[PDB]
Design a binder for this molecule. Structure first.
Ligand SMILES: Cc1c2c(c(O)c3c(O)cccc13)C(=O)[C@]1(O)C(=O)C(C(N)=O)=C(O)[C@@H](N(C)C)[C@@H]1C2
Ligand SMILES: Cc1c2c(c(O)c3c(O)cccc13)C(=O)[C@]1(O)C(=O)C(C(N)=O)=C(O)[C@@H](N(C)C)[C@@H]1C2
Ligand SMILES: [Cl-]
Ligand SMILES: [Cl-]
Ligand SMILES: [Cl-]
Ligand SMILES: [Cl-]
Ligand SMILES: [Cl-]
Ligand SMILES: [Cl-]
Ligand SMILES: [Cl-]
Ligand SMILES: [Cl-]
Ligand SMILES: [Mg+2]
Ligand SMILES: [Mg+2]
Lengths: 203, 203
């Protein structure tokens, strides 16, 4: 079929959902596209190049809150940005693992620069704004990775529990992690605000 | 050589540092131990069983702050627990990925139950204490995963930056992520405290 970049991404994403990240291979991608492996090689040099591209295109296509709305507070931005990033990560099987393979790509530079500048325009130093943005990113990624690895590990093998842990798993599995994620997100934001408003005061 | 459980773990950990998680195989483990693959199979049924065991033994051996000190505050416990968990995760190549393969194992039940009970004894509901413990876990795991994947991806391929991002990478690479981790950790803890002390007040 067609092997323009967009079409190759479409197929690779379709394949990722079928196989997961570990099981995705350029050989399987060539099969899905109806082509020979050396043909695919002209377009996609190896799995790593493919994964790097997926990490970018997943956010380009499905992360709709990269940028603040006009007039938006930094708090509200971090909240909306996190919710969007989580959704985009969860959209594809092993999505968090796909993301983590790389740091910002050149096509992402303008976006992430704008985010860093936005925090500095709202009273943060570059360093403290980077600390906040990174903390949100890492908390979000960790939460998704946990969900997605539990989905995986369930396919290899199943799972005398003590009472609070029993209850905690029952609670942690009453939704897809969303309550825990949102509650932690608010805690994080509030801690950043306390820190910011403190200025040079001992806090 | 010897194939008691302890000795197999020792060798597998040694191998993990040599290969990383994706490149670790039971075939390579059998080679390191000087044995045939069917011999190893009697002891270790597959890679997943091996990884599950490593996730547990890495913490048993190297996470020394599972439990609070007598009289310790919940804040100080979460801090010390996080620092220890991070160190243990960072100790082995792809350690965060090793951890994420599983939820608490039976040999961990008493430990994690004690942690959940400890939060409830310090004013949290089980749910809100679980929210805090999970948030710390996920933030810590996300931060480590980012560091460890950057170490990996560097071996496949290297890396016009805009100025804040340039500076952010220079800042994010001035240590091994420790400043960013510790600053986020304090933000998280403080947000949990604000929430706890609020009780039923609009906050
Ligand atoms: C600023 C920054 C970001 C990211 C990142 O990986 C990163 C880094 O690895 C080093 C230095 C800075 C950054 C994000 O991945 C990203 O997810 C992202 O690419 C991004 C985006 N593309 O819109 C975001 O929304 C951000 N958000 C989750 C806080 C965050 C921004
Ligand atoms: C309570 C709990 C924990 C963990 C966990 O995975 C988990 C879960 O998957 C479902 C429900 C509850 C928990 C931890 O991994 C763990 O890392 C852990 O095993 C653990 C430990 N073994 O000492 C911890 O130190 C904890 N800390 C990082 C907050 C955390 C505790
Ligand atoms: Cl074509
Ligand atoms: Cl195209
Ligand atoms: Cl491949
Ligand atoms: Cl707002
Ligand atoms: Cl033996
Ligand atoms: Cl033993
Ligand atoms: Cl294997
Ligand atoms: Cl204390
Ligand atoms: Mg990133
Ligand atoms: Mg865990």
């Amino acid at each position: 079929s067609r092997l323009n970049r967009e079409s190759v991404i479409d197929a690779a994403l379709e394949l990722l959902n079928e196989t997961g990240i570990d099981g995705l291979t350029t050989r399987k991608l060539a099969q899905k596209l109806g082509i020979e492996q050396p043909t695919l090689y002209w377009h996609v040099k190896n799995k790593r190049a493919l994964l790097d591209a997926l990490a970018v295109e997943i956010l380009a296509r499905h992360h709709d809150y990269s940028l603040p709305a006009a007039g938006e507070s930094w708090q509200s931005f971090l909240r909306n940005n996190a919710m969007s990033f989580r959704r985009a990560l969860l959209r594809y099987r092993d999505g968090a693992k796909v993301h983590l393979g790389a740091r910002p790509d050149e096509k992402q530079y303008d976006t992430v620069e704008t985010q860093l500048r936005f925090m500095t325009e709202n009273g943060f130093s570059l360093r403290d704004g980077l600390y906040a943005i990174s903390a949100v990113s890492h908390f979000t990624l960790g939460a998704v990775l946990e969900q997605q690895e539990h989905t995986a590990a369930l396919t290899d093998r199943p799972a005398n529990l003590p009472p609070l842990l029993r209850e905690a798993l029952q609670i942690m599995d009453s939704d897809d992690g969303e309550q825990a994620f949102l509650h932690g997100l608010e805690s994080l934001i509030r801690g950043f605000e306390v820190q910011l408003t403190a200025l040079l005061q001992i806090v």
